[PDB]
Write a protein that binds this ligand. Structure first.
Ligand SMILES: C[C@]12CCc3c(ccc4cc(O)ccc34)[C@@H]1CCC2=O
Ligand SMILES: C[C@]12CCc3c(ccc4cc(O)ccc34)[C@@H]1CCC2=O
Lengths: 120, 120
């Protein structure tokens, strides 16, 4: 159903674990099939599991991700977290904001970051 | 005008400095006069500088606040940051998400946190 604050902490942490390994099918299944994803925030949103799968495929395919502090969760199915992505030879500080639906799936994801958060 | 990513880092950091000391008039002046503030996210929004000033007055009046990681800024006048608030004898992990207007003032502020983020 619509995830409690504590359940939101678990789901969002699970998302980060999945990104870290790069299990694309399992990542994609975390989203609603009509999920919208803004990454970075300000860019036009990509929509739906097909467009989202492609995003993660060229994102992660050829990469590491960890939380830098606790997940902050609300009581209306949303949450936000700080993490850092590492890659190739650099690093990127990120904050994701996620809203979950009544099935425990991600309906909306906005990622906040820009080049000032980037470090080679 | 509408603040660049770097300017957003400065503004949002300045907000945190102001909260730390508790300079209420200066905090309030950071907001647009018609700013909406959701704190915590999920609660109904308070609106306008009068309702916002009252919020900070009973919040900070009788308290310390610092960033726990870098501000994450976008290119469309928004940004997000992790910080921790301390008070009385406890501590609270928080993530604020802010949108700025074309005057460098805060038009919308949503704060993400709940009791799982609280620690006595
Ligand atoms: C897309 C990305 C890979 C993964 C990733 C990036 C940026 C923000 C993200 C936010 C997420 O919630 C999950 C993954 C990313 C990367 C930026 C550069 C890059 O290759
Ligand atoms: C309201 C509060 C004081 C300040 C503050 C709290 C919570 C979230 C905040 C978010 C902000 O961007 C600025 C200040 C607060 C506190 C929670 C409890 C409390 O007393």
């Amino acid at each position: 159903n619509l995830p409690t604050a504590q359940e939101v902490q678990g789901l969002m942490a699970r998302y980060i674990e999945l990104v870290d390994v790069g299990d694309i099918e399992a990542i994609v299944q975390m989203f609603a099939d009509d999920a919208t994803v803004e990454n970075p925030f300000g860019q036009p949103p990509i929509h739906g599991r097909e467009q989202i799968a492609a995003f993660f495929r060229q994102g992660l395919g050829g990469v590491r991700a960890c939380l830098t502090g606790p997940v902050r969760a609300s009581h209306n199915g949303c949450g936000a977290m700080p993490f850092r992505v590492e890659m190739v030879p650099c690093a990127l500080d990120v904050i994701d904001v996620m809203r979950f639906d009544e099935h425990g799936r991600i309906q909306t994801m906005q990622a906040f970051w820009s080049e000032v958060n980037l470090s080679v």
